[PDB]
């Protein structure tokens, strides 16, 4: 009868830095839980990321825009680090419009009800000309992992961005001694978490534990096409009366059976002459088939 751990305290050091305490733990369970939780947290948390961008006048990413300090590639790199929290759906499109001299940041994005920008001071670009304006449309969707744009037609002007959906930046854990009521052999686990501010630490811990339990449930209960043309019936061929009768006398019902027969075998059968053999070859060649084709594992359950 082991003592179960519980979530004791959550310390929110910053908006992107937190500490979560689990207590109490038996002898040796601290590292067993800590390493698994660190791996799952670094590997499998879900998040939202920018995947597509459409700028008004640009055609590709190897170009420039008049009045803009940065190149298109640097703008895409800046957008790759945008932090967005979406609470209603798995896809959204944001609109950005700006004009005049100054830094274009993330606080200039048009407001949406179900979209939250956690770092409004994120700089996107700079406008250096008074009569210079920029308008863009940004696509954000939810996922997990890292999906490069190459591994996923489009109109000319739509620029793809590599997606890093993971919201966790780094994970550390420590095991100290817990001063429980009447025992001096219990430990305490402290998990230090650094993220981009778009996920709650407690829900992250719960999601990691749920994933671990679902994966572990498999050990708690531990115990041990041919081409269509070949499947058509022989009556699909428009053979003569005698040819059809001779084929039916050899129990040749489907095309896959006739095709495997060679010319000699069809020539030594009774009541079949050279002319009927030539007719059969002609009707087979009309569809692009021959005699003497070898098929493995025939028939396919009729």
């Amino acid at each position: 009868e082991f003592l179960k751990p519980r979530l004791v305290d959550i310390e929110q050091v910053s908006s992107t830095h937190a500490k979560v305490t689990l207590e109490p733990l038996e002898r040796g369970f601290g590292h067993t839980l800590g390493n698994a939780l660190r791996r799952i947290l670094l590997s499998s948390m879900p998040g939202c990321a920018v995947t597509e961008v459409e700028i008004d006048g640009v055609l590709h990413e190897y170009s420039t825009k008049e009045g803009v300090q940065e190149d298109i590639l640097e703008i895409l790199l800046n957008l790759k680090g945008l932090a967005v929290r979406v609470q209603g759906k798995d896809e959204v499109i944001l609109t950005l419009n700006k004009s005049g001299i100054g830094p274009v940041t993330a606080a200039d994005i048009t407001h949406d009800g179900d979209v939250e920008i956690v770092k409004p001071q994120h700089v996107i670009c700079h406008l250096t000309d008074e009569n210079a304006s920029i308008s863009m449309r940004i696509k954000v969707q939810r996922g997990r992992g890292y999906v490069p744009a190459s591994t996923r037609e489009r109109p000319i002007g739509r620029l793809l961005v590599d997606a890093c959906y993971s919201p966790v930046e780094r994970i550390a854990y420590n095991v100290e001694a817990a001063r429980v009521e009447q025992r001096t052999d219990l430990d305490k686990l402290v998990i230090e978490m650094e993220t981009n501010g778009t996920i709650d630490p407690e829900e992250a811990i719960r999601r990691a534990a749920t994933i671990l339990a679902e994966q572990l449930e498999a050990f708690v209960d531990l115990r041990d096409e041919f081409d269509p043309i070949l499947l058509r019936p022989v009556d699909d061929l428009e053979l003569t009366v005698r040819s059809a009768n001779c084929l039916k006398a050899e129990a040749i019902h489907y095309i896959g059976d006739l095709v495997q027969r060679t010319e000699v075998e069809l020539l030594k059968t009774p009541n079949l002459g050279k002319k009927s053999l030539t007719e059969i070859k002609d009707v087979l060649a009309s569809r692009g088939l021959s005699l003497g084709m070898r098929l493995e594992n025939w028939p396919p359950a009729s």
């Binding site: 007719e279 070859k281 002609d282 060649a285 692009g288």
Partner: peptide, 9 residues
């Protein structure tokens, strides 16, 4: 007729 069959193929 054999020539015709070969040509069709």
């Amino acid at each position: 007729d054999e020539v015709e069959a070969v040509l069709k193929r």
